[PDB]
Design a protein around this ligand. Structure first.
Ligand SMILES: [Mg+2]
Ligand SMILES: [Zn+2]
Ligand SMILES: [Zn+2]
Ligand SMILES: [Zn+2]
Lengths: 44, 58, 58, 138, 64, 76, 50, 463, 1044
RNA sequence: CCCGAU
């Protein structure tokens, strides 16, 4: 599990039941990394 | 809101849908164009009566 | 006819003849329905649902 | 295609297919493929004496000569400014030839426009030979 | 957002005429004859540059 | 014998109402039908051929009645 | 920051100089392509600071 | 969902199309009171086979073509079809066998594809041969050869010529003989909803209801195919006043203002005669309104004289498709006095309508008169008074439906349990007689002809 | 004379739009919290009188948030929008009291002063109005309420001339309504504490003026109708021998449910008395004076209570509840901060709960104003700015006193056709002030009261009596000197600019109003026929070498409220200046709001067609802010390629609407085509929609939070259940990503699971699934703690919809239209130069609606694109047609715009010319995918067993009782049994023959004999009627019969 | 309850 900070944008490997703070920040808005699967789109 | 004026007379109804309307002059005055997705949901129980046996099997 | 709005007289010949057929002119209010109808649920589906149901149980 | 800021990626494969333009307009081989009938403008009355240069600025610029002569009619956009003049509108009838038009093909660049037209005729002929072979079956 | 790469009515390729248009407006070129330099004859392909706003340089600021 | 000899629109509706529901329960059909699978479309073929096994019981509001065969009526 | 479909739609409107009538139509669904029907393109852009 | 009359629920046959909108023919939209501006409407589906026939027979559109208030037809052409068929049956149109077989062959789909459509012989033969417009409108009433419809109708029209029965050059006098339009042009009053002498009402009574619904579903297919290839279009050239209006409106605004300056001055400075209604400063305003409505209607007549034919809002007003001649005078010439609930606008400030005018000013353009038309654009005081008079329309529809919704409810909660019994008497639910025959004659108001008479014998004998 | 419009962009920088929300709150923070401490110092208790708690000051700091013991970190407002917190700052020896939320762009918010570069790191849009609190994550506005004035002698017409002054106690504890009635020709003083309509001369003798000569001298010395005060009451007073002052308190001393010297202070309050009642008598006498000489909706009477005035109604009450509970504690533990820190819950969860649930439930002021706050509508940009300038009422018709203050055309329709107004551009609501220098100049300029003989203030012309804020302050012989001298003084700047002196000559009362809450507006002063702006001033403002507030002190611009506008001669333009002009008008397009004003040429349309757009302008679908991608809101509509309009107005530039527009501008060609455009419908083409004309972006939002319970167990987000392989469920846990939360950048079908929120009862999983109808792609997934730190997780679902059949477009003139048909491009009437249209519009929308302003946008737009220019069509001005039309001629076009087309289908040219050009078509948020609905057979409601209400709950739409009568009138009997018993409530019940009552199943419990019990067939709702009738004592005893 | 649709 790798999450991206609010504005620091550092990948922070947290685990479960862990506060969502950040390395090099304290900001608690952590988005998730984009998926790894082949996503098919239609140009219509 | 009570049972008389809203649950005994004006009661909600199954097999009923609601969309936005748009014109179609290419229909006869007696016909409404119904979308496919609605027409696959609203169903009519047609009993099987020796004339719609092959039609309902199909 | 003052407001445009043409109408058959046979509709007004019915509304007047209902309104005055039990003796006196019975205006179509909540009160005139009690003097027009005998059945309770037709009165009870109209206004004053509380009193019309208890009084017809009395 | 898109704009980026540092740390951002775009990674994608594409698939191209052969599509009719009426399926979706991204398959359209031509920007505009319109046509217009060639106009011809006949001065019924001879015009001269400063009404000619009045009729010059009335039309499209290149169309006219100055007496008044309708020098080259093909360049006329139909502003229809004559009818604002109230004097020359009785003088000249404006008209367009029916069986003489002007095509104007401008390709997007897939095929050169002299091969777009010769393909356009080629599939109309194929659309009617597709039907003439239906009657040969029946 | 970003410049739509077609005209909506005719479909002239107009997405490649944005930074070439902004490069013209950086110079003296008036709003009118800048689009005559890019080969935009009819007005429907002319409004795709004229009436367009470029939010994508502004959204990028708020997208680290 | 005293009511209207015209089949009203409320009698044509219910005669087509119940002859449709009868023929949708495998009733015997009277019109040697030609591929109509909607039971309602069979019933209008029954009405126009004037073969419907139904007698309308018309109630005068005093309580007396007056029968009327659907053969014996003037449809529109 | 450009959305996925709007990117995928804006890749659609780009014309492609490979002429047709070398290729044929896509018969089935056939999302794999058969190199007689399709023509693949790659786009890999990752920007940094200079 | 705001069901206001019997025609808001109607049955329809259902054809599964490819979209998510409920699409119906636009002739049946005035019974629903349904425009297509984002309106939604519900679709119930009856389950038992008995409730399927009760929808089809009683509530079908082929049965309820006619509203039960008057007997008028509600399902008839709206908007474009009326202004399509007026522009087609107008005297000037002529089609060659190119366009004639193209407009006619539009009417060949969907129960109509199996008829040998008979083009009538053309009405010009020798110098060029070509059809006329009205001869193609006759193909709507009788497309085949073996069609049994012979429609007959003779009536007046809008912009009626006044003198002359059918022979005057204005040509607003319809005469159909045996479903062939012989003279006249199809107005709203000969095709639309509300008139008891349009053809779809005449085809209903005389020839069954299947031929009226077919001839109405023929016109809805035919008239756009003509109009989309004829190109009826509005523009701002259709709103600009010519030269003749401006010199007419300028004098009418001056000579209409000299007198109202004197009629005000004849009141306060001296002695003014009084109308019998009230005192001064009440009949002054009623004499102001007479001279201002002189202005907006003479300029409204100055507009209509110079307005060239084939003007688009004029053509939409001759046939009554959309907007009368009042709207053309408002758009072009001059929109008149803006009235609030039947008077000049009341002073919201002290003795003054807006603080731009003077105190106790009874002047025009200070108590609600707007001088500029919508083309030349309203001015800020004029735009405010038009807004003030405009909101009384919007406010009253909010409060009327708050009352007539209740008045619909009290009415139907007393009057619901009456039905004309089989011995022609109309009784209550309890057996008590209200009427001995329904309405004296026992006659449907729905089937009733105009004048509250079932026949109108002049029409039937000529038919 | 040429350029005076420049005063408006200088006014908007200072105090114009959404700055009246802010200044009102900035007054509330920086003044009103220090005027409640002066009212509520000295917390004393009786159980110990030797201690005292005395507040010195309250400071309200910067917004902060703690997540632990003492981190105390600050917050940006677009973090509270994500973490569902509440953007608030602490309230404060020097110890905290509570926390109060701060509206954005306030004096203590973070966003003020900072550059657009710093708005990025705070993740906030610079083109964002502010004036909205962020409470519990959502963003609420306090809507401007309008109340009637305070202590106003209103002369109504209940039966004949009743007058009631709704006095509001400056000591705000109560608000009483001491109205005065006339019964059979006699005056009375009805109150709500009085048990009897007592005659007024009873009051007058109770008020100290005992003799009857004085009372008439008060009411009328000139007798002509005030003699008919005589045999009314002072005879009726004298008819019972009751001439005595003490005895006439005694009749009051009975009915008031010696003891009434005090209780006459709770009657006509704000006239002050120190047991010298002479000031009270004249104010009652003037109230009688009106009646014998004898507008509720007129905007000199309507004062507006803003967001900062309305919070001071709350915080004073919440401070008192904090205050009185200190007395309840100090009287509990004495027979002190440490018993106060738990009352940080009192203010904070008191203030926040009043904004989120919009309820001032204040029993202390007896007011229960419901729905004061509203969630912001972030549909477009102007649907946010159209909420900031909004006024809710407590009549429907437009009054002309709203000229210049409110928008005439911006209103809803329906329930609120004239009850929800919108502020215009150049307005300003006033704040309160002190009344010191107003009185100090009043008593110098000449006034005298309480020494003047009763007779003076009467029909004599030179007795204009000065009234300030509703309290009489003397009488002046010469009204003109007073009105003129105050006005010169205000212009000079000695008196506050906002105060207004107005004079009513019908009743001689001048009216100095320093009320605060008055609707105000600026005008250019016209001394003699030359105005005061002088152009050169309009040039100073050009370089900035001067500011709009320098115009005020130079006596060039005057603020006028509605009351002063009775006394002025406002000239609209320069050329309408008269001999007695008084004030002039700055820029006359400012009478329109901000939702109208967007319209080009509103002065050419019929006026009920601008009003349709003011609703649809808020419904537009466009861009929201520059932070529109970082916002995770519940429903956010975005356009793919917005375009600024070709015909802009002038209000569009001041709002900077073109900086973030809404809607494209498509080349329409108004003509009738194919008959699929009949009732306002409009044909699009299937090439522009393939080229991206108005592609939608509808962004939903699903969320969950994982709370730790009191059981000390918590929620889990355990990953997918792989079955027989690493592959996840058949499609159910396919997008989960193995951390629980679904993966961003992936599509979600129907009934696919977003998170596995599992709950402790032992774990029952409550999977948060995405319902929808169509698929949606995850764009962002945010993970945070809320205030009570419980791991909230927020999704964000893309969806793009090309506009297909059904999708409502409007046309910037209120001519909205569902897109009836989408033809291919090659079937569409191309003109000569090749331009096929996008949106064929029907020409029948024009001659009935008379929207001529649309017909000029096809002209001003078409000349605009051809010249490379944006044509101003503002209100009451802009580019005229006689110069636009001669610009088409230079580019070789028709001078009306009607271009010769040839038809696409048949190939021959069209018989008539077709109007043609670009007009601004804005797509709006009524797309048919959100409204397509059908219910075959689904959930029934648990109580009444009918189908549920709503499409979110799988629907069923109410065949109402109005449609019951339609089904009655057709005579369809068997339909109604099918439609209201068979397919709604198909129930089956058992009753018995004898004693007929509902007995369950096979036998009836009453009379156990089981033999008579015979089943019925009934709707369930009727069975629930019988069973709830029988619950009370009404017993429907059914008596069955067999089918005959 | 608000909002919004008609
Ligand atoms: Mg509507
Ligand atoms: Zn960080
Ligand atoms: Zn183009
Ligand atoms: Zn029993």
């Amino acid at each position: 599990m790798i999450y991206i900070c609010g504005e620091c944008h550092t990948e922070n490997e947290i685990k479960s039941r862990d506060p969502i703070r950040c390395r090099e920040c304290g900001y608690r808005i952590m988005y998730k990394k984009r998926t790894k699967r082949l996503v098919v789109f239609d140009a219509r | 809101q009570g049972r008389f004026r809203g649950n005994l007379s004006g009661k909600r109804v199954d097999f009923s849908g609601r969309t936005v309307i748009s014109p179609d002059p290419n229909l006869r005055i007696d016909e409404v164009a119904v979308p496919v997705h609605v027409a696959k949901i609203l169903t009519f129980p047609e009993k099987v009566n020796k004339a719609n046996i092959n039609f309902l099997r199909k | 006819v003052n407001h445009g709005m043409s109408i058959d007289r046979r509709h007004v010949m019915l509304l007047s003849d209902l309104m005055t057929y039990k003796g006196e002119v019975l205006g179509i209010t909540r009160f005139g329905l009690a003097k027009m109808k005998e059945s309770v649920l037709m009165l009870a589906s109209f206004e004053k649902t509380a009193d019309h149901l208890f009084d017809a149980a009395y | 295609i898109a704009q980026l800021r540092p740390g951002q990626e775009i990674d994608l494969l594409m698939h191209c297919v052969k599509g009719i333009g009426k399926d979706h307009a991204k398959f359209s081989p031509v920007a505009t493929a319109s046509y217009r009938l060639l106009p011809d403008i006949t001065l019924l009355e001879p015009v001269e004496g400063e009404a000619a240069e009045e009729l010059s600025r009335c039309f499209s610029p290149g169309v006219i000569e100055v007496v008044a002569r309708v020098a080259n009619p093909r360049l006329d956009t139909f502003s229809r400014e004559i009818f604002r003049n109230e004097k020359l509108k009785k003088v000249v009838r404006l008209a367009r030839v029916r069986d003489h038009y002007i095509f104007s093909v401008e390709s997007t660049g897939v095929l050169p426009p002299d091969v777009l037209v010769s393909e356009a005729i080629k599939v109309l002929m194929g659309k009617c030979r597709r039907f003439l072979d239906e009657l040969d079956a029946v | 957002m970003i410049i739509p790469v077609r005209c909506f009515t005719c479909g002239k390729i107009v997405g490649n005429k944005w930074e070439a248009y902004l490069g013209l407006l950086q110079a003296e070129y008036t709003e009118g004859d800048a689009l005559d330099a890019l080969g935009l004859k009819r007005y429907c392909c002319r409004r795709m540059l004229l009436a367009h706003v470029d939010l994508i340089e502004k959204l990028l600021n708020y997208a680290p | 014998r005293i009511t209207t000899p015209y089949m009203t629109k409320y009698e044509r509706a219910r005669v087509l109402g119940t002859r449709a529901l009868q023929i949708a329960m495998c009733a015997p059909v009277m019109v040697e039908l030609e591929g109509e699978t909607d039971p309602l479309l069979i019933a209008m073929k029954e009405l126009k051929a004037r073969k419907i096994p139904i007698i309308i019981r018309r109630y005068l509001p005093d309580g007396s009645y007056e029968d009327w065969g659907v053969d014996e009526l003037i449809i529109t | 920051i450009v959305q996925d479909e709007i990117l995928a739609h804006r890749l659609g409107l780009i014309p492609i100089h490979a002429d047709p009538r070398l290729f044929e139509y896509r018969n089935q669904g056939d999302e794999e392509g058969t190199e007689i029907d399709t023509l693949q393109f790659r786009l890999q852009v990752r920007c940094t600071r200079n | 969902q705001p069901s206001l009359h019997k025609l808001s629920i109607m049955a329809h046959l259902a054809r599964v199309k490819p979209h998510r909108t409920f699409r119906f023919n636009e002739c049946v939209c005035t019974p629903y009171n349904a425009d297509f501006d984002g309106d939604e409407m519900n679709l119930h589906l009856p389950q038992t086979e008995e409730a399927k026939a009760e929808a089809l027979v009683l509530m079908g559109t082929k049965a309820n073509l006619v509203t039960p208030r008057n007997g008028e037809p509600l399902i008839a052409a709206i908007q474009d079809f009326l202004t399509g068929a007026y522009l087609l049956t107008l005297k000037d149109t002529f089609f060659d066998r190119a366009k004639a077989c193209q407009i006619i062959a539009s009417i060949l789909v969907g129960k109509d594809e199996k008829i040998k459509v008979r083009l009538p012989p053309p009405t010009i033969l020798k110098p060029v041969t070509l059809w006329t417009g009205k001869q193609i409108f006759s193909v709507i009433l009788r497309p085949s050869d073996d069609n049994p419809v012979r429609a007959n109708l003779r009536t007046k029209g809008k912009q009626y010529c006044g003198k002359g029965e059918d022979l005057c050059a204005n040509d607003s006098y319809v005469t159909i003989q045996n479903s062939e339009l012989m003279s006249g042009s199809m107005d709203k009053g000969t095709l639309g909803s509300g008139s008891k002498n349009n053809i779809f009402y005449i085809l209903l009574r005389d020839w069954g209801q299947n031929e009226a619904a077919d001839a109405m579903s023929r016109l809805a297919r035919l008239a756009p195919v003509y109009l989309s290839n004829r190109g009826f279009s509005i523009g701002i050239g259709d709103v600009t006043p010519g030269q003749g209006l401006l010199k007419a409106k300028y004098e009418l605004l001056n000579a209409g203002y000299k007198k109202c300056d004197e009629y005000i001055e004849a009141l306060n400075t001296g002695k003014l005669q009084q109308q019998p209604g009230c005192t001064a400063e009440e009949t002054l305003e009623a004499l102001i309104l007479k001279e201002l409505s002189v202005i907006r209607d003479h300029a409204g007549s100055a507009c209509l004289r110079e307005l060239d034919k084939s003007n688009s809002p004029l053509t939409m007003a001759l046939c009554g498709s959309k907007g009368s001649f009042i709207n053309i005078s408002q758009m072009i010439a001059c929109v008149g006095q803006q009235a609030i609930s039947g008077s000049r606008v009341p002073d919201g400030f002290e003795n003054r309508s807006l603080p731009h005018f003077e105190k106790h000013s009874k002047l025009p353009a200070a108590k609600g008169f707007v001088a500029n038309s919508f083309y030349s654009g309203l001015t800020p005081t004029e735009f405010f008074f038009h807004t003030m008079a405009g909101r009384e329309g919007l406010v009253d529809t909010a409060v009327k439906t708050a009352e007539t919704g209740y008045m619909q409810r009290r009415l139907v909660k007393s009057l619901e349990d009456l039905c004309s019994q089989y011995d022609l008497t109309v009784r209550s639910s309890t057996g008590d007689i209200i009427q001995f025959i329904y309405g004296g004659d026992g006659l449907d108001p729905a089937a009733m002809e105009g004048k509250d008479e079932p026949l109108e014998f002049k029409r039937v004998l000529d038919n | 004379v040429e350029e005076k419009w420049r005063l408006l962009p200088a006014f908007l920088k200072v105090k114009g739009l959404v700055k009246q929300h802010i200044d009102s709150f900035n007054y509330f923070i920086n003044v009103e919290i220090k005027k409640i401490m002066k009212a509520n110092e000295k917390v004393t208790s009786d159980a110990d009188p030797m201690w005292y708690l005395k507040y010195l000051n309250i400071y309200v700091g910067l917004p902060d948030v703690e997540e632990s013991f003492n981190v105390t970190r600050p917050v940006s407002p677009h973090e509270c929008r994500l973490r569902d917190m509440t953007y608030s700052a602490p309230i404060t020896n020097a110890l905290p009291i509570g926390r109060m939320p701060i509206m954005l762009r306030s004096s203590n918010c973070v966003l003020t002063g900072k550059t657009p570069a710093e708005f990025a790191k705070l993740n906030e849009c610079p083109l964002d109005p502010g004036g909205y609190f962020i409470v519990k994550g959502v963003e609420k506005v306090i809507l401007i309420q309008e109340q009637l004035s305070k202590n106003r002698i209103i002369v109504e017409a209940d039966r004949k001339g009743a007058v009631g002054a709704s006095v509001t106690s400056s000591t705000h504890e109560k608000k009483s309504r001491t109205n005065m009635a006339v019964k059979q020709g006699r005056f009375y003083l009805r109150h709500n504490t009085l048990s009897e309509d007592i005659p007024i001369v009873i009051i007058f003798k109770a008020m100290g003026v005992e003799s009857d000569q004085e009372i008439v001298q008060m009411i009328g010395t000139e007798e002509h109708v005030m003699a008919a005060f005589g045999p009314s009451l002072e005879e009726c007073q004298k008819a019972q021998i009751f001439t005595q002052m003490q005895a006439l308190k005694y009749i009051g001393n009975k009915v008031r449910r010696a003891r009434e010297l005090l209780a006459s202070t709770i009657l006509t309050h704000v006239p002050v008395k120190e047991f010298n009642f002479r000031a009270k008598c004249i104010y009652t006498a003037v109230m009688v004076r009106r009646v014998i000489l004898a507008d509720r909706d007129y905007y000199g009477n309507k004062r507006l209570e803003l967001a900062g005035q309305l919070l001071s109604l709350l915080f004073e009450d919440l401070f008192k509840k904090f205050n009185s509970e200190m007395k309840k504690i100090a009287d509990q533990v004495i027979p002190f901060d440490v018993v106060k820190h738990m009352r940080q819950d009192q203010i904070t969860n008191g203030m926040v709960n009043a904004i989120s649930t919009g309820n001032w439930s204040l029993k202390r002021f007896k007011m229960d104003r419901q729905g004061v706050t509203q969630v912001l509508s972030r549909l477009s940009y102007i649907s946010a700015l159209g909420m900031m300038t909004r006024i809710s009422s407590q009549p429907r018709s437009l009054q002309p006193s709203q000229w210049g203050m409110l928008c005439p055309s911006d209103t809803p329709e329906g329930e609120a056709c004239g009850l929800v107004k919108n502020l215009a551009l150049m307005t300003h609501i006033t704040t309160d002030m002190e009344d010191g220098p107003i009185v100090k100049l009043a008593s110098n300029l000449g006034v005298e009261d309480v020494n003047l003989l009763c007779g003076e203030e009467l029909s004599y012309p030179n007795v204009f009596l000065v009234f300030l804020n509703g309290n009489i302050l003397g009488v002046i012989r010469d009204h003109k000197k007073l009105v003129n001298t105050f006005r010169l003084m205000r212009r000079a700047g000695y008196i506050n600019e906002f105060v207004s002196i107005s004079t009513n000559l019908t009743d001689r009362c001048v009216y100095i109003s320093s009320d605060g809450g008055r609707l105000c507006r600026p005008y250019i002063i016209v001394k003699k026929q030359k105005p005061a702006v002088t152009n050169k001033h309009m040039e100073e403002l050009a370089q900035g070498y001067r500011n709009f507030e320098d115009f005020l002190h130079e006596s060039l611009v005057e603020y006028l409220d509605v009351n002063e506008e009775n006394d002025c001669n406002i000239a609209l333009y320069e050329h309408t200046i008269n001999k007695d002009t008084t004030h002039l008008e700055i820029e006359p397009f400012t009478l329109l709001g901000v939702c109208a004003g967007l319209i080009p040429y509103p002065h050419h349309n019929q006026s009920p067609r601008n009003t349709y757009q003011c609703a649809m302008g808020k419904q537009a679908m466009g861009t929201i802010g520059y932070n529109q991608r970082n916002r995770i809101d519940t429903l956010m509509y975005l356009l793919a390629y917005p375009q600024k309009p070709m015909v802009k107005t002038k209000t569009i530039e001041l709002i900077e609407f073109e900086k973030l527009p809404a809607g494209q501008n498509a080349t329409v060609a108004v003509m009738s085509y194919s008959g699929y455009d009949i009732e306002d419908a409009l044909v699009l083409n299937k090439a522009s929609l393939d080229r991206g004309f108005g592609r939608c972006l509808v962004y939903k939002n699903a969320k969950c939070t994982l709370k730790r319970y009191t059981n000390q167990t918590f929620d889990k987000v355990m990953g997918p259940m792989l079955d027989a392989a690493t592959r996840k469920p058949i499609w159910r846990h396919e997008i989960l990503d193995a951390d629980g939360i679904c993966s961003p950048g992936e599509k979600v079908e129907n009934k696919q699971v977003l998170v596995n929120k599992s709950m402790p009862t032992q774990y029952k999983d409550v999977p948060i699934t995405y319902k929808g109808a169509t698929d949606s792609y995850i764009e962002k997934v945010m993970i945070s703690s809320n205030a009570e730190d419980a791991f909230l997780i927020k999704m964000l679902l893309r969806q793009t919809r090309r506009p297909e059949i059904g999708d409502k477009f409007s046309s910037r003139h209120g001519q909205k239209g569902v897109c009836g048909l989408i033809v291919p491009q090659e079937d569409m009437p191309f003109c000569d130069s090749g331009i096929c249209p996008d949106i064929i519009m029907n020409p029948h929308g024009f001659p009935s609606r008379m929207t001529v302003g649309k017909l000029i946008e096809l002209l001003a737009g078409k000349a605009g694109v051809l010249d490379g220019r944006f044509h101003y069509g503002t209100a009451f001005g802009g580019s005229k047609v006689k110069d636009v039309c001669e610009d088409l001629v230079r580019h070789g076009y028709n001078y009306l715009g009607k271009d010769y087309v040839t038809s696409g289908i048949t190939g021959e040219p069209l018989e008539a010319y077709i109007y043609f050009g670009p007009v601004y078509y804005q797509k709006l948020k009524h797309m048919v995918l959100d409204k397509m609905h059908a219910r075959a057979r689904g959930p029934r409601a648990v109580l009444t067993r009918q189908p549920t209400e709503g499409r979110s709950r799988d629907g069923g739409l109410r065949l109402g009782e109005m449609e019951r009568d339609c089904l009655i009138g057709y005579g369809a009997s068997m339909l109604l049994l099918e439609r209201l018993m068979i397919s709604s409530d198909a129930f089956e019940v058992d009753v018995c023959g004898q004693c007929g009552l509902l007995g369950y199943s096979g036998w009836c419990h009453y009379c156990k004999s089981s033999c008579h019990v015979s089943s019925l067939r009934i709707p369930y709702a009727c069975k629930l009627l019988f069973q709830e009738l029988q619950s009370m004592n009404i017993i429907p005893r059914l008596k069955l019969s067999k089918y005959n």
